[PDB]
């Protein structure tokens, strides 16, 4: 049951005025593609807060990657789901090496040394790489049953150029005439149920490949792409959500650089 929104004053949407004229804002299966200018964050914040939404953010920090945790967490505190309940899950082989980061109210962090837990603790799961930093708003506009993020190096490429696994012997195989987009393995998510279904599917597919003596060209990312090809995401995040300014600069098409690789 969703309670009614309160009175709100904002610009009236204009039916005869495109949101963006430079980019695709909706997929062929009617899933929005999230770009700056397509959403009113005040309306979305209201909708998700009225549901007391809790977002889980998972990251793996093994070996030398634990060094990226401080900046990652500090910047997440300034830009990730601010105003909403957030539960960070840091999977690491060095529990004592996790930095003591100060968190805002309603936000918590759990250190797990290296699934029903997620089902009872959070509503949505967001899975990202740790060698990154938030530089701008990353909020509830991304929440949906299942979402993928456009790889910054292939958003303008033809499917032929996508680095999908091209060997038929692999479970991640995708032929040259198939494919919608090339999604990043480093930023995906959705409801706990959908995220677990995806990881369960990929885990099994990778086991089959291993038994068959084959490893997908881009590992988990290759399997992720096969999954999202066969199970269309309900939202697709633009490259604003995972960019590399050092290698790609700052194109006009990107009004904001929200989550980026650390040099
Ligand atoms: O502890 C880790 C290890 C890896 N990664 C992410 O997973 C990617 C691929 O890891 P892999 O070990 O397969 O290759 P490598 O990290 O040596 O380039 C890394 O680049 C990161 O983006 C991470 O976030 N935490
Ligand atoms: Cl991840
Ligand atoms: Hg718009
Ligand atoms: Hg995850
Ligand atoms: Hg993860
Ligand atoms: Hg998969
Ligand atoms: Hg996957
Ligand atoms: Mn990375």
From Swiss-Prot:
Keywords: Blood group antigen, Glycoprotein, Glycosyltransferase, Golgi apparatus, Manganese, Membrane, Metal-binding, Secreted, Signal-anchor, Transferase, Transmembrane, Transmembrane helix. It catalyses: an alpha-L-fucosyl-(1->2)-beta-D-galactosyl derivative + UDP-N-acetyl-alpha-D-galactosamine = an N-acetyl-alpha-D-galactosaminyl-(1->3)-[alpha-L-fucosyl-(1->2)]-beta-D-galactosyl derivative + UDP + H(+); an alpha-L-fucosyl-(1->2)-beta-D-galactosyl derivative + UDP-alpha-D-galactose = an alpha-D-galactosyl-(1->3)-[alpha-L-fucosyl-(1->2)]-beta-D-galactosyl derivative + UDP + H(+). Binds 1 Mn(2+) ion per subunit. UDP-N-acetyl-alpha-D-galactosamine binds at residues 60-62, 65, 129-131. It comes from the Eukaryota. Mn(2+) binds at residues 129, 131. An alpha-L-fucosyl-(1->2)-beta-D-galactosyl derivative binds at residues 151, 163, 221, 244. Changing residue 102 to M: In allele Aw08. Its EC number is 2.4.1.40, 2.4.1.37. This protein is the basis of the ABO blood group system. The histo-blood group ABO involves three carbohydrate antigens: A, B, and H. A, B, and AB individuals express a glycosyltransferase activity that converts the H antigen to the A antigen (by addition of UDP-GalNAc) or to the B antigen (by addition of UDP-Gal), whereas O individuals lack such activity. This is Histo-blood group ABO system transferase. It comes from Homo sapiens (Human). The chain holds residues 64 to 345 of 354 of the full protein.
């Amino acid at each position: 049951f969703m309670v009614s929104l309160p009175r709100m004053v904002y610009p009236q949407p204009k039916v005869l005025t495109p949101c963006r004229k430079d980019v695709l804002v909706v997929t062929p299966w009617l899933a929005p593609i999230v770009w700056e200018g397509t959403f009113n964050i005040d309306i979305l914040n209201e909708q998700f807060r009225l549901q007391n939404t809790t977002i889980g953010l998972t990251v793996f920090a093994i070996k030398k990657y634990v060094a990226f945790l401080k900046l990652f967490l500090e910047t997440a505190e300034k830009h990730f789901m601010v105003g909403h309940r957030v539960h960070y899950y840091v999977f690491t082989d060095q529990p004592a090496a996790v930095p003591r980061v100060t968190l805002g109210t309603g936000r918590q962090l759990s250190v797990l040394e290296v699934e029903r837990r997620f089902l009872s603790e959070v509503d949505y799961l967001v899975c990202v790489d740790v060698d990154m930093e938030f530089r701008d708003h990353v909020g509830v506009e991304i929440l949906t049953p299942l979402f993928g993020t456009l790889h910054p190096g292939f958003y303008g490429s033809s499917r032929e150029a996508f680095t999908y696994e091209r060997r038929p012997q692999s479970q991640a195989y995708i032929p040259k005439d198939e494919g919608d987009f090339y999604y990043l393995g480093g930023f995906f998510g959705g409801s706990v149920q959908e995220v677990q279904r995806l990881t369960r599917a990929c885990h099994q597919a990778m086991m089959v490949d291993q038994a068959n003596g084959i490893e997908a060209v881009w590992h988990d990312e290759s399997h992720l792409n096969k999954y999202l090809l066969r199970h269309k995401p309900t939202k697709v995040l633009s490259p604003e959500y995972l960019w590399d300014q050092q290698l790609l600069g700052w194109p006009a098409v990107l009004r904001k650089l929200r989550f980026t690789a650390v040099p």
